[PDB]
Design a protein around this ligand. Structure first.
Ligand SMILES: Nc1cccc2c1C(=O)N([C@H]1CCC(=O)NC1=O)C2=O
Ligand SMILES: [Zn+2]
Ligand SMILES: [Zn+2]
Lengths: 32, 826, 374
């Protein structure tokens, strides 16, 4: 894992992530 | 593969045109009437009208105008048919033999050309220099009037104004000048052009483009003293002439549109104008000599004379008598008195010529003979709406029942010795909130009366409001006595409820006979109906009571009695209801189709379904399975007006451009693919618009079975009041009669020299194929009216077979016996 | 210019093997060709009629096709992309056809014997029955072309009353004839397309019903197998009526991105507050979401744990929901915090992520086929 509390959050939908990389990937999906 | 015979039982009664002049002889005055394919010629007497000659044409009469060229004794008649057959006819009488000889003829159709929005417009120059025809948008065809032009060779002239509304030839012009109203993105305008036969082109008109009213719909050329033209619109009437342009907006013409006119005085001082609602006005043109003798228009005036039938055309005969040519009602002869009567009208009816009018629905009933059938039709529209009971003499005898409102559907109930009729009356939105009737009609003057109890849609209603003055039609189920034809009861339907279908039958174990009605809730904001009902009524003790009520998700377009069950059609679904012991409808089957189930007809367990675009579909109720199954279909896009099941394998229909067609269940079919397709096995250009097909016959049914040559009998009602009959034949009888038609055509004289083959050929604006699987009964029956040598020529070198053996040389006396047997089917 | 064959005529034209998607008359087909047989074949067509066949496959795996569309090439250019020399060509759909024979040549390219299906054009339904006296009243005095005035049904009421006045001579009412009217049917589509998504109507859709019907048949959110039904239809009237049926049958919503996942149905829509089922809500960072509330939704994965932080529906905790297939954000799952809450569990879907679609029946227990109406 990374950080159990999920401190990395998405400003567009509030999706929290354990690692920054996963959040970066998530925010790239909003662009489409 | 299909062998059918079609014959006219009643000729078209609706008048689509009328003109006066001196056609027979230069001395006496004539009135020519056009009743679709028929042309009636009368002589105007001081008493009334004297019938002189009646002829039939092989074409629907589109244009009909009289004209006297330079160096001619009497007037000639120019006629143009719907299939573009142009002709100049002359009246020729020798002792006691009358004949309408064809002076000149020819087809004026143009391969390629978009037909105009305002239809065919045919006009003649006042000096008879040419005939101007407007058939297609962007082109003006010209037939020059020269003694050499016998084939009617004509040339088109390029017209920059595509959307021409009305056009006329002006009077008192040096060169032939056309005046017309047309539309462009800046509105409507009136423009003129000079037509040059030498250059074969248009030239600058005497007075270029002038702006007219938004709804300018009529153009009237005014004779030599005045000159110029009158343009009529919705709110105004304007006169234009060179520099002067006088316009009046009389309030008396605002309530309805002026749709027909006629010149009273030959100088143009008076004109008759007729609106859509039957009113008759007098347009007067005041004169002014102006010293030098130029004479100018001082003023325009409109006076309301009175009410007539809804006039299609008008024609002033003489001494105050006007002939009112009607399509929606009876045509008339009316007197125009100088002084009014106590009510205020200046019009007084003289004669009333019967018009079966738009036959929208009909039925066959025995009534009193208990053997010989009689035909009851839903005729006319609005105040002209009525019922007509047609029966044979034992010539056709007609009894009229005026309703003063539009009748729509009709069915008979023997158990209660009466008829059920769906009908609608127009009411106007009142200041108070409710609606007010226009006149007292059949639904308002009923002995017993009732209103539908709002339960289903009183709670389930959309929010909206109707503004003052708006018209709204009120639907009613009328119970009419079979003997007296008095309105025994009138049941009004819900607000916004449109009654579509009506049947009278016994359902399930129930011994009572009910009047079932199918409806649809029509709101203006709602495009396709999403609400409707099936109301089961029982008429007893002089009152109509609601037995049951079943809500549905759509419009109940059609319903039929199906083996003790009710087969209804809700939009795309074909539903089967069962009548439960609790006296309620219960759904047993549903069949979701690829078309709108408008046309619903049935034979035993077979169901014929059809939509407005000639999509034909054959379903079948599987009793052991308890559901519907599609057997076959034939979807060719074209407008379809009516449908019927001839026999277990053949299906008759009425498709676009007044054609009849027969579809058949494919025999000798190995593959499922071919079994599932209905083959087109018959096509025939009837020349009438069929609204209703009805199984039955207007002749004695014949108790003892004596080898009938024709099998089956399907009557039909049309828009022009024509009633026809269709029947099936054997291959032998068909091939004989077909060979007979082609022999008959060589000896028979066609008015305007139009070919029978061309006339009956199946026609639409896109496709035009020859007629098949149909014998023209009117042509076959005309054999008995011809002369013995022409019969000898027709039967010359022809082999006739009487059955089994003896295939001998045919004689006119053998054939007379055969055609005489055919005349007995109607 | 323009090369066009005769109606119902028999023609033999080539089929590009790389192509598969249905081509509707009027819409453009861009192509990228690499193989010399494809390039050389197209170069020959430029010298000849410039036309080739585009088959409407029922099954692209087995290459099964009964109908198709002739594609006229209107642009050719030899480009270079990613270090690859490729020719780029643009063709436009022209005539529709029925497939008679599919003979395959020595190459991968195949010829196709085809019968040209004509464009059925009918006159006005009233043209036959119109009264000669009323012919001059058939023409209208221009269009109101004010979005508000023509959206207002009072004008269409006047149109119906005037155009179909002679319905009184027939056995049917005016309103029935409007159901088979080109202008009314186009307007109904335009209004429902605007209802689906806000857009400029005057520019985007053509005024001609033949062109309009094809433009819509190409853009509808449907399966290409269903689209074949629109290609088979020859009358623009029937084509428009079929398109409105298809539109009315789009009672479900799917992932706009992948369009392979049915999220929810219109039946599941519900109003939690008096504002309405759909309403715009802003998040704590300024992102505005037009959110639709539905009782149930599926084919979604939840991301993270639920949270009440800045919840748009007090008393509920949001959990981020994304597409099972493409992982695109679809919205949130709202779960109640207390036991006395009314719906208890619901979903807030973002409108922009959804797209209308016909409910699919992937289950083989009761696969009742979609029966479109003309
Ligand atoms: N706390 C954060 C932080 C970042 C992004 C969001 C939120 C948040 O609460 N919402 C939505 C989620 C859905 C909801 O109910 N309300 C919101 O404001 C976000 O997009
Ligand atoms: Zn996000
Ligand atoms: Zn997805």
């Amino acid at each position: 894992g990374g950080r159990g509390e999920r401190p990395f959050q998405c400003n567009q939908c509030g999706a929290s992530f354990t690692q920054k990389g996963n959040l970066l990937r998530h925010i790239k999906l909003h662009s489409g | 593969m299909s062998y059918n015979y079609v014959v006219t039982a009643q000729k078209p009664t609706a008048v689509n045109g009328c003109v006066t002049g001196h056609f027979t002889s230069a001395e006496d005055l004539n009135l020519l009437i056009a009743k679709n394919t028929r042309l009636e010629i009368y002589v105007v007497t001081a008493e009334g009208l004297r019938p002189v000659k009646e002829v039939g044409m092989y074409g629907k009469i589109a244009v009909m105008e009289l004209f006297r060229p330079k160096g001619e004794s009497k007037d000639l008649l120019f006629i143009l048919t719907a299939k573009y057959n142009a002709c100049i006819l002359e009246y020729k009488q020798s002792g006691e033999s009358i004949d309408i000889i064809t002076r000149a003829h020819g087809n004026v159709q143009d391969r390629i050309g978009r037909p105009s929005e305002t239809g065919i417009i045919g006009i003649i120059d006042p000096e008879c220099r040419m005939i101007g025809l407007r058939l297609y948008d962007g082109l003006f065809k010209v037939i020059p009037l020269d003694r050499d032009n016998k084939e009617l060779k004509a040339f088109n002239i390029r017209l920059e104004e595509l959307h021409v509304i009305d056009v006329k030839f002006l009077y008192g012009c040096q060169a032939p000048t056309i005046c017309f109203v047309y539309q462009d993105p800046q509105g409507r305008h009136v423009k003129t052009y000079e037509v040059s036969l030498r250059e074969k082109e248009f030239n600058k008109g005497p007075w270029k483009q002038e702006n007219v009213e938004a709804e300018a719909s009529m153009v009237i050329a005014v004779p030599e003293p005045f000159g110029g033209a009158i343009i009529i619109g919705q709110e105004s009437i304007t006169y234009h002439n060179g520099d002067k342009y006088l316009a009046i907006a009389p309030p008396i013409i605002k309530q309805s549109t002026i749709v027909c006119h006629n010149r009273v005085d030959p100088n143009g001082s008076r004109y008759l104008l007729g609106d859509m609602e039957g009113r008759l006005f007098m347009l007067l043109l005041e004169k002014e000599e102006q010293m030098d003798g130029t004479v100018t228009l001082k003023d325009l005036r409109v006076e309301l004379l009175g009410e007539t039938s809804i006039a299609e055309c008008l024609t002033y005969l003489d001494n105050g008598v006007v002939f009112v040519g009607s399509r929606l009602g009876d045509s008339q002869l009316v007197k125009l008195n100088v002084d009014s009567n106590e009510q205020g009208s200046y019009v007084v009816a003289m004669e009333t010529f019967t018009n079966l009018g738009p036959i929208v629905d009909m039925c066959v009933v025995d009534l009193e003979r208990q053997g010989q059938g009689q035909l009851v039709t839903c005729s006319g529209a609005f105040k002209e709406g009525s019922l007509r009971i047609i029966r044979n003499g034992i010539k056709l005898h007609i009894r009229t029942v005026p309703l003063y409102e539009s009748p729509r559907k009709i069915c008979y109930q023997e158990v209660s010795q009466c008829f059920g009729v769906l009908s609608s009356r127009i009411e106007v939105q009142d200041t108070s909130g409710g609606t007010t009737a226009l006149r007292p009609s059949a639904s308002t003057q009923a002995l017993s009366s009732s209103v539908s109890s709002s339960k289903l849609f009183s709670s389930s209603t959309a929010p909206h409001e109707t503004s003052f003055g708006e018209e709204v039609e009120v639907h009613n189920l009328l119970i009419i006595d079979q003997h007296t034809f008095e309105v025994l009861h009138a049941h009004q339907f819900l607000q916004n409820e449109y009654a579509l279908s009506l049947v009278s039958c016994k359902l399930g174990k129930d011994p009572n006979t009910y009047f079932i009605v199918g409806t649809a809730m029509v709101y203006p904001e709602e495009a396709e109906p999403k609400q409707g009902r099936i109301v089961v009524f029982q008429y007893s003790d002089g009152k109509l009571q609601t037995v049951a009520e079943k809500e549905v998700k759509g419009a109940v377009y059609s319903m039929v009695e199906f083996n003790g069950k009710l087969l209804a059609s809700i939009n795309s679904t074909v539903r089967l209801y069962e009548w439960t012991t609790e006296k309620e409808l219960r759904t047993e089957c549903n069949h979701y189709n690829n078309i709108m189930a408008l046309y619903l007809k049935t034979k035993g367990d077979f169901i014929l379904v059809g939509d407005l675009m000639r999509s034909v579909l054959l379903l079948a109720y599987k009793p052991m399975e308890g559901n519907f199954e599609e057997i076959a279909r034939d979807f060719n896009p074209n407008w379809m007006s009516a449908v019927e099941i001839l026999d277990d394998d053949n299906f008759l229909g009425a498709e676009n451009a007044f054609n009849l067609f027969v579809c058949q269940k494919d025999s000798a079919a190995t593959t499922d693919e071919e079994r599932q397709h209905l083959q087109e096995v018959g096509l025939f250009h009837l020349g009438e618009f069929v609204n209703v097909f009805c199984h039955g016959s207007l002749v004695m049914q014949n108790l003892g079975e004596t080898s009938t040559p024709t099998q089956g009998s399907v009557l039909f009602g049309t828009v022009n009041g024509m009633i026809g009959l269709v029947t099936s034949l054997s291959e032998s009888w068909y091939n004989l009669l077909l060979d007979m038609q082609n022999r008959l055509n060589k000896v028979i004289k066609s008015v305007g020299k139009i070919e029978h083959s061309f006339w009956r050929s199946f026609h639409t604006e896109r496709k035009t194929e020859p007629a098949t699987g149909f014998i023209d009964g009117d042509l076959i029956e005309s054999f008995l009216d011809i002369s013995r040598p022409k019969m000898q020529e027709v039967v010359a070198n022809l082999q006739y077979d009487d059955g089994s053996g003896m295939k001998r040389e045919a004689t006119a006396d053998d054939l007379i016996k055969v055609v005489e047997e055919l005349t007995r089917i109607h | 210019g323009r090369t066009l064959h005769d109606d119902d005529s028999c023609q033999v034209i080539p089929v590009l093997p790389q192509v598969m998607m249905i081509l509707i008359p009027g819409q453009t087909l861009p192509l990228q060709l690499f193989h010399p047989q494809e390039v050389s074949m197209v170069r020959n067509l430029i010298q000849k009629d410039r036309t080739f066949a585009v088959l409407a496959y029922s099954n692209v795996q087995e290459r099964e096709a009964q109908f198709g569309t002739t594609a006229e090439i209107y642009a050719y250019r030899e480009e270079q992309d990613f270090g690859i020399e490729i020719v780029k060509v643009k063709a436009i759909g022209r005539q529709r056809f029925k497939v008679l024979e599919l003979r395959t040549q020595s190459d991968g390219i195949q010829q196709a014997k085809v019968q040209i299906l004509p464009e059925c054009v009918l006159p006005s339904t009233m043209s036959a029955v119109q009264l000669e006296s009323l012919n001059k009243c058939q023409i209208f005095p221009s269009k109101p072309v004010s979005r508000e005035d023509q959206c207002s049904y009072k004008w269409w009421q006047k149109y119906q009353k005037r155009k179909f006045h002679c319905a009184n001579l027939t056995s049917w009412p005016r309103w029935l004839y409007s159901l088979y009217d080109a202008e009314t049917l186009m307007d109904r589509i335009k209004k429902q397309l605007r209802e689906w998504d806000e857009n400029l109507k005057d520019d985007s859709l053509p005024s001609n019903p033949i062109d309009f019907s094809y433009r819509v048949a190409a853009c509808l959110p449907i399966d290409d197998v269903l689209r074949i039904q629109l290609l088979k239809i020859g009358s623009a009237i029937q084509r428009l009526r079929c398109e409105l049926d298809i539109m009315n049958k789009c009672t479900s919503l799917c992932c706009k991105q992948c369009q392979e996942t049915e999220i929810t149905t219109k039946n599941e829509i519900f109003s939690l507050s008096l504002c309405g089922p759909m309403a715009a809500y802003v998040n704590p960072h300024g992102y505005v979401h037009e959110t639709l509330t539905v009782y149930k939704a599926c084919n979604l994965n939840l991301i993270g744990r639920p949270s009440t932080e800045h919840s748009w529906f007090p008393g509920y905790a949001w959990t981020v929901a994304q597409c099972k297939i493409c992982a695109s954000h679809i919205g949130w799952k709202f779960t109640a915090t207390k036991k006395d809450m009314s719906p208890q569990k619901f979903w807030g879907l973002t409108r922009s992520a959804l797209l209308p679609t016909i409910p699919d029946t992937e289950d083989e227990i009761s696969p009742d086929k979609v029966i479109l109406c003309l």
